[PDB]
From a paper:
Among the three subtypes (α, β/δ, and γ), PPARγ is the most widely studied as a therapeutically attractive target because of its key role in the regulation of energy balance and fat cell differentiation in adipose tissue. PPARγ is a ligand-activated transcription factor which forms a heterodimer with the retinoid X receptor (RXR) and binds to specific promoter response elements (PPREs) on the DNA, acting as a gene expression regulator. Ser245 phosphorylation by CDK5 results in the dysregulation of a subset of PPARγ target genes that are known to be associated with tissue insulin sensitization, whereas its inhibition maintains the transcription of several of these genes (and the correlated insulin sensitization) unchanged. Further studies also showed that partial distortion of the β-4 strand makes PPARγ more susceptible to phosphorylation and that PPARγ ligands serve to stabilize this β-strand, thus making this region of the ligand binding domain (LBD) less available for energetically plausible binding with a kinase, regardless of the degree of ligand agonism or antagonism.
The crystal structures of PPARγ-LBD in complex with 1 and 3 were determined at 2.13 Å and 2.20 Å, respectively, each comprising two PPARγ-LBD monomers in the asymmetric unit. Conversely, while occupying the same hydrophobic region of 1, compound 3 was observed only in molecule B of PPARγ-LBD. As the ligand was modeled with an occupancy of 0.78, the electron density arising from the omit map was relatively weak and it was probably masked by the bulk-solvent model. For this reason, the interpretative power of the residual map was improved by preventing bulk solvent from entering the selected omit region using the Polder (omit) map approach available in the Phenix software suite. In this way, the weak density became visible, and the ligand was clearly modeled inside the electron density. As described by the superposition between the two ligands, compound 3 was more deeply positioned within the hydrophobic binding pocket; moreover, the side chain of Arg288 was shifted in the PPARγ–LBD/3 complex and involved in a cation-π interaction with the naphthalene ring of the ligand. The ligand interacted with Ser342 through a hydrogen bond between the carbonyl oxygen of the lactone moiety and the NH of the serine backbone. The positioning of the ligand inside the pocket was also facilitated by many hydrophobic interactions involving residues Phe226, Leu228, Cys285, Ala292, Glu295, Met329, Leu330, Leu333, Leu340, Ile341, and Met364. Conversely, the activity of compounds 2 and 3 could be ascribed mainly to a direct CDK5 inhibition rather than PPARγ stabilization, although all three compounds bind PPARγ with good affinity.
Author numbering:
A (entry chain B): 207 to 238, 245 to 258, 278 to 453, 468 to 473
B (entry chain A): 203 to 259, 277 to 476
The structure:
Amino acid sequence: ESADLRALAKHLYDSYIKSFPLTKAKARAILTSPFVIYDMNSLMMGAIRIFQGCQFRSVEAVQEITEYAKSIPGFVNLDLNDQVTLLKYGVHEIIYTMLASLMNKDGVLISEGQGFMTREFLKSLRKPFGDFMEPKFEFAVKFNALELDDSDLAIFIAVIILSGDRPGLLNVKPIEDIQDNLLQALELQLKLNHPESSQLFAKLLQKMTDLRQIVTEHVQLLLLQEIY
Amino acid sequence: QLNPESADLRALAKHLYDSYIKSFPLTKAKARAILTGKTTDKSPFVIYDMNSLMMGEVAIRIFQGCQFRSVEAVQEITEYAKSIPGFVNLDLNDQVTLLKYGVHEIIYTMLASLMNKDGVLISEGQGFMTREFLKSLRKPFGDFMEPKFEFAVKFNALELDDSDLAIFIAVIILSGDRPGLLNVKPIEDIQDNLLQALELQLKLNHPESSQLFAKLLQKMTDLRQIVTEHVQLLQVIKKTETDMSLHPLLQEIYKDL
Ligand SMILES: O=C1O[C@H](c2ccc(OCc3cccc4ccccc34)cc2)C(c2ccccc2)=C1O
């Protein structure tokens, strides 16, 4: 069985690379030369306008995530409504996962890494804008201390999408069966890639709690308008 | 065959199951025995309406009883937690922090053991109160137990028995991502050991059960949600029912949760 699992993991990893331009390996190299937004004069040279821009980029993400999901073995063979339902409820969770790749404790890469917007400047935004990104920063510092890389996140992202508990699925069985196989593939992946990281698998799963917590909290704070 | 590492995880499993039996007078095993007619001596009285309530013996009188059941559950969980190796060795402040946030998640975990899709065991298993009688209570008391039922039916589908739950509720208590924790690292190393012990336990007790470990852990999402929903509904109760008194042990657990 362990053969197909490695083959599943590599399959997911290649697809992840093709679907997501800005990988985690790339983002970290940059964070360790982008234009820095630390202030208002800084931003101009680069409140409502900032929050709408996160919206624009979030919409582009969903298309990337959607393309990635269709590479997940068995995903397209699912009931079409079930596919739509899985992406509908899954993309927020995936966006925050992947946003963590672009953050450190001091700020976030924007514009596919061409910029960097400081955590402090974000906080300085008047209410309720100045509070939308602080909880994601809190989650990212926790998340990134796991030091996953892109081949780990490729499987992780796939497991999130194949969640058999989205509201209103029609045929939960093949979803959980795929998720079952993805979890097996994640577990072996973490074991070979992090032999020293004890029970990394378990601590990763526990972050879905956190992730879902962020997503519900974000929702609450929340023609062109047609597009969003 | 099993090695010295496995053998230490097995002994921690045995020790926690043992303490669990000593701390919780109504186990799942007994609850299931009562709910499924393995009884001629253990069958419960069934409350499904006002006269059946009257016969065993409103929406506040029920609520005051579930809330003082909760208090003596906190005590049982508190007794069980002291038995988790390393728990009492941690900073006293963290000990209370771990209890403050963990108690509710464990209470609804264990409450599931007393539930089927149709109702819930009460008064140590002597009684059984139907899901319908509860959902029929005046607002917002009718909204009280429905999320718990919905959790339980999914959670009960995992078919965990008590030796599993003992380790799982120990993983819950020893949660290093709790608000305000002084020393997270000693907490994580205990939970890391619990997680190893749960992982082996699930694989030995449920070998035909693919990825039960992962599926069990993902249920922590559902508990956190039950807790959140419960707090909100308690917020509403305090405004509409200012003559209703909540219990101090429980006051302290909700302050800034
Ligand atoms: O212009 C912008 O870019 C920014 C940005 C927004 C979301 C974002 O999410 C990261 C991300 C989310 C989902 C899928 C991805 C796939 C590949 C790489 C990153 C992916 C990344 C950059 C961004 C922005 C604005 C406000 C707060 C945070 C970021 C812009 O104003």
